[PDB]
JSON list of C-alpha atoms in Angstrom, two decimals:
[
{"chain": "A", "resi": 1, "resn": "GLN", "atom": "CA", "xyz": [63.79, 104.19, 78.96]},
{"chain": "A", "resi": 2, "resn": "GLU", "atom": "CA", "xyz": [65.93, 104.78, 82.03]},
{"chain": "A", "resi": 3, "resn": "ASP", "atom": "CA", "xyz": [69.56, 103.74, 82.31]},
{"chain": "A", "resi": 4, "resn": "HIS", "atom": "CA", "xyz": [72.03, 103.99, 85.18]},
{"chain": "A", "resi": 5, "resn": "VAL", "atom": "CA", "xyz": [75.68, 102.96, 85.27]},
{"chain": "A", "resi": 6, "resn": "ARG", "atom": "CA", "xyz": [77.79, 103.35, 88.40]},
{"chain": "A", "resi": 7, "resn": "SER", "atom": "CA", "xyz": [81.43, 102.32, 88.34]},
{"chain": "A", "resi": 8, "resn": "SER", "atom": "CA", "xyz": [83.75, 102.62, 91.33]},
{"chain": "A", "resi": 9, "resn": "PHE", "atom": "CA", "xyz": [87.42, 101.75, 91.22]},
{"chain": "A", "resi": 10, "resn": "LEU", "atom": "CA", "xyz": [89.74, 101.91, 94.20]},
{"chain": "A", "resi": 11, "resn": "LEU", "atom": "CA", "xyz": [93.43, 101.12, 94.10]},
{"chain": "A", "resi": 12, "resn": "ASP", "atom": "CA", "xyz": [95.79, 101.10, 97.05]},
{"chain": "A", "resi": 13, "resn": "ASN", "atom": "CA", "xyz": [99.52, 100.45, 97.06]},
{"chain": "A", "resi": 14, "resn": "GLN", "atom": "CA", "xyz": [102.27, 100.46, 99.68]},
{"chain": "A", "resi": 15, "resn": "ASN", "atom": "CA", "xyz": [105.97, 99.77, 99.26]},
{"chain": "A", "resi": 16, "resn": "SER", "atom": "CA", "xyz": [108.28, 99.66, 102.26]},
{"chain": "A", "resi": 17, "resn": "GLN", "atom": "CA", "xyz": [112.04, 99.15, 102.20]},
{"chain": "A", "resi": 18, "resn": "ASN", "atom": "CA", "xyz": [114.59, 99.02, 105.02]},
{"chain": "A", "resi": 19, "resn": "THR", "atom": "CA", "xyz": [118.34, 98.61, 104.58]},
{"chain": "A", "resi": 20, "resn": "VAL", "atom": "CA", "xyz": [120.79, 98.34, 107.49]},
{"chain": "A", "resi": 21, "resn": "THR", "atom": "CA", "xyz": [124.53, 97.81, 106.98]},
{"chain": "A", "resi": 22, "resn": "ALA", "atom": "CA", "xyz": [126.75, 97.76, 110.07]},
{"chain": "A", "resi": 23, "resn": "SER", "atom": "CA", "xyz": [130.52, 97.25, 109.83]},
{"chain": "A", "resi": 24, "resn": "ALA", "atom": "CA", "xyz": [133.19, 97.17, 112.54]},
{"chain": "A", "resi": 25, "resn": "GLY", "atom": "CA", "xyz": [136.87, 96.46, 112.00]},
{"chain": "A", "resi": 26, "resn": "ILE", "atom": "CA", "xyz": [139.56, 96.29, 114.68]},
{"chain": "A", "resi": 27, "resn": "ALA", "atom": "CA", "xyz": [142.86, 96.36, 112.79]},
{"chain": "A", "resi": 28, "resn": "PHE", "atom": "CA", "xyz": [145.94, 96.13, 115.02]},
{"chain": "A", "resi": 29, "resn": "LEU", "atom": "CA", "xyz": [149.52, 96.41, 113.74]},
{"chain": "A", "resi": 30, "resn": "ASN", "atom": "CA", "xyz": [149.56, 93.15, 111.77]},
{"chain": "A", "resi": 31, "resn": "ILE", "atom": "CA", "xyz": [148.81, 91.12, 114.92]},
{"chain": "A", "resi": 32, "resn": "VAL", "atom": "CA", "xyz": [145.00, 91.04, 115.07]},
{"chain": "A", "resi": 33, "resn": "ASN", "atom": "CA", "xyz": [142.54, 91.88, 112.28]},
{"chain": "A", "resi": 34, "resn": "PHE", "atom": "CA", "xyz": [138.91, 91.33, 113.32]},
{"chain": "A", "resi": 35, "resn": "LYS", "atom": "CA", "xyz": [136.35, 92.61, 110.81]},
{"chain": "A", "resi": 36, "resn": "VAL", "atom": "CA", "xyz": [132.58, 92.09, 111.07]},
{"chain": "A", "resi": 37, "resn": "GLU", "atom": "CA", "xyz": [129.89, 93.33, 108.71]},
{"chain": "A", "resi": 38, "resn": "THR", "atom": "CA", "xyz": [126.18, 92.57, 108.90]},
{"chain": "A", "resi": 39, "resn": "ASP", "atom": "CA", "xyz": [123.50, 93.46, 106.37]},
{"chain": "A", "resi": 40, "resn": "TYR", "atom": "CA", "xyz": [119.71, 93.52, 106.48]},
{"chain": "A", "resi": 41, "resn": "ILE", "atom": "CA", "xyz": [117.21, 94.28, 103.72]},
{"chain": "A", "resi": 42, "resn": "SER", "atom": "CA", "xyz": [113.42, 94.25, 103.85]},
{"chain": "A", "resi": 43, "resn": "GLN", "atom": "CA", "xyz": [111.15, 95.05, 100.90]},
{"chain": "A", "resi": 44, "resn": "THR", "atom": "CA", "xyz": [107.39, 94.74, 101.15]},
{"chain": "A", "resi": 45, "resn": "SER", "atom": "CA", "xyz": [104.71, 95.54, 98.60]},
{"chain": "A", "resi": 46, "resn": "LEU", "atom": "CA", "xyz": [100.96, 95.47, 99.10]},
{"chain": "A", "resi": 47, "resn": "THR", "atom": "CA", "xyz": [98.50, 96.42, 96.38]},
{"chain": "A", "resi": 48, "resn": "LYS", "atom": "CA", "xyz": [94.74, 96.16, 96.88]},
{"chain": "A", "resi": 49, "resn": "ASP", "atom": "CA", "xyz": [92.29, 96.82, 94.07]},
{"chain": "A", "resi": 50, "resn": "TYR", "atom": "CA", "xyz": [88.52, 97.01, 94.12]},
{"chain": "B", "resi": 1, "resn": "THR", "atom": "CA", "xyz": [133.29, 87.93, 109.58]},
{"chain": "B", "resi": 2, "resn": "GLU", "atom": "CA", "xyz": [137.06, 88.03, 109.10]},
{"chain": "B", "resi": 3, "resn": "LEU", "atom": "CA", "xyz": [139.72, 87.34, 111.73]},
{"chain": "B", "resi": 4, "resn": "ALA", "atom": "CA", "xyz": [143.49, 87.38, 111.21]},
{"chain": "B", "resi": 5, "resn": "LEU", "atom": "CA", "xyz": [145.65, 86.51, 114.23]},
{"chain": "B", "resi": 6, "resn": "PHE", "atom": "CA", "xyz": [149.43, 86.94, 114.24]},
{"chain": "B", "resi": 7, "resn": "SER", "atom": "CA", "xyz": [149.27, 87.64, 110.48]},
{"chain": "B", "resi": 8, "resn": "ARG", "atom": "CA", "xyz": [149.16, 83.86, 109.99]},
{"chain": "B", "resi": 9, "resn": "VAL", "atom": "CA", "xyz": [145.85, 82.43, 111.28]},
{"chain": "B", "resi": 10, "resn": "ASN", "atom": "CA", "xyz": [143.11, 83.62, 108.93]},
{"chain": "B", "resi": 11, "resn": "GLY", "atom": "CA", "xyz": [139.39, 82.98, 109.23]},
{"chain": "B", "resi": 12, "resn": "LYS", "atom": "CA", "xyz": [136.31, 83.98, 107.25]},
{"chain": "B", "resi": 13, "resn": "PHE", "atom": "CA", "xyz": [132.63, 83.30, 107.92]},
{"chain": "B", "resi": 14, "resn": "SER", "atom": "CA", "xyz": [130.00, 84.60, 105.50]},
{"chain": "B", "resi": 15, "resn": "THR", "atom": "CA", "xyz": [126.32, 83.67, 105.74]},
{"chain": "B", "resi": 16, "resn": "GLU", "atom": "CA", "xyz": [123.28, 85.01, 103.91]},
{"chain": "B", "resi": 17, "resn": "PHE", "atom": "CA", "xyz": [119.56, 84.38, 104.41]},
{"chain": "B", "resi": 18, "resn": "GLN", "atom": "CA", "xyz": [117.09, 85.46, 101.75]},
{"chain": "B", "resi": 19, "resn": "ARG", "atom": "CA", "xyz": [113.32, 85.02, 101.98]},
{"chain": "B", "resi": 20, "resn": "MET", "atom": "CA", "xyz": [110.86, 86.09, 99.30]},
{"chain": "B", "resi": 21, "resn": "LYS", "atom": "CA", "xyz": [107.12, 85.71, 99.75]},
{"chain": "B", "resi": 22, "resn": "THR", "atom": "CA", "xyz": [104.24, 86.39, 97.38]},
{"chain": "B", "resi": 23, "resn": "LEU", "atom": "CA", "xyz": [100.47, 86.25, 97.73]},
{"chain": "B", "resi": 24, "resn": "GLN", "atom": "CA", "xyz": [97.76, 87.09, 95.23]},
{"chain": "B", "resi": 25, "resn": "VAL", "atom": "CA", "xyz": [94.00, 87.01, 95.64]},
{"chain": "B", "resi": 26, "resn": "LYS", "atom": "CA", "xyz": [91.64, 87.77, 92.77]},
{"chain": "B", "resi": 27, "resn": "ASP", "atom": "CA", "xyz": [87.87, 87.62, 93.19]},
{"chain": "B", "resi": 28, "resn": "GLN", "atom": "CA", "xyz": [85.16, 88.31, 90.65]},
{"chain": "B", "resi": 29, "resn": "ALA", "atom": "CA", "xyz": [81.41, 88.21, 91.15]},
{"chain": "B", "resi": 30, "resn": "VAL", "atom": "CA", "xyz": [79.19, 88.94, 88.15]},
{"chain": "B", "resi": 31, "resn": "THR", "atom": "CA", "xyz": [75.42, 88.96, 88.54]},
{"chain": "B", "resi": 32, "resn": "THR", "atom": "CA", "xyz": [73.05, 89.59, 85.65]},
{"chain": "B", "resi": 33, "resn": "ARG", "atom": "CA", "xyz": [69.26, 89.65, 85.81]},
{"chain": "B", "resi": 34, "resn": "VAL", "atom": "CA", "xyz": [66.98, 90.24, 82.83]},
{"chain": "B", "resi": 35, "resn": "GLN", "atom": "CA", "xyz": [63.21, 90.44, 83.15]},
{"chain": "B", "resi": 36, "resn": "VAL", "atom": "CA", "xyz": [60.82, 90.91, 80.24]},
{"chain": "B", "resi": 37, "resn": "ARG", "atom": "CA", "xyz": [57.06, 91.10, 80.58]},
{"chain": "B", "resi": 38, "resn": "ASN", "atom": "CA", "xyz": [54.74, 91.72, 77.64]},
{"chain": "B", "resi": 39, "resn": "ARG", "atom": "CA", "xyz": [51.01, 92.20, 78.12]},
{"chain": "B", "resi": 40, "resn": "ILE", "atom": "CA", "xyz": [49.31, 92.32, 74.74]},
{"chain": "B", "resi": 41, "resn": "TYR", "atom": "CA", "xyz": [45.55, 91.89, 75.08]},
{"chain": "B", "resi": 42, "resn": "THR", "atom": "CA", "xyz": [42.97, 91.84, 77.83]},
{"chain": "B", "resi": 43, "resn": "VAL", "atom": "CA", "xyz": [40.30, 89.33, 76.83]},
{"chain": "B", "resi": 44, "resn": "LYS", "atom": "CA", "xyz": [36.95, 89.61, 78.57]},
{"chain": "B", "resi": 45, "resn": "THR", "atom": "CA", "xyz": [33.69, 87.72, 78.24]},
{"chain": "B", "resi": 46, "resn": "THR", "atom": "CA", "xyz": [30.82, 89.62, 76.70]},
{"chain": "B", "resi": 47, "resn": "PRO", "atom": "CA", "xyz": [28.20, 90.23, 79.42]},
{"chain": "B", "resi": 48, "resn": "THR", "atom": "CA", "xyz": [25.54, 88.70, 77.15]},
{"chain": "B", "resi": 49, "resn": "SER", "atom": "CA", "xyz": [27.29, 85.34, 77.14]},
{"chain": "B", "resi": 50, "resn": "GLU", "atom": "CA", "xyz": [25.51, 82.03, 77.64]}
]
């Protein structure tokens, strides 16, 4: 009797995440108040098995 | 965005965009082959046959 077993397992995984937050506020002496804030998020995941 | 002019004219403007995406691929391929071969007897004619 001869017997062979070959098992290969490969797992790959990537997670990326970006976060930008930009604020700008021009605050005069109770005459003009101009405030601007922008946000940006980006999450990616990628898992590959075999 | 916020904007206050003359401490009387107020304005706000808040937007938000959110996109989520998901993909999944799952493949399986199973192949089984069984092969049995029994050889029991070898039957021959006697050379003195008629």
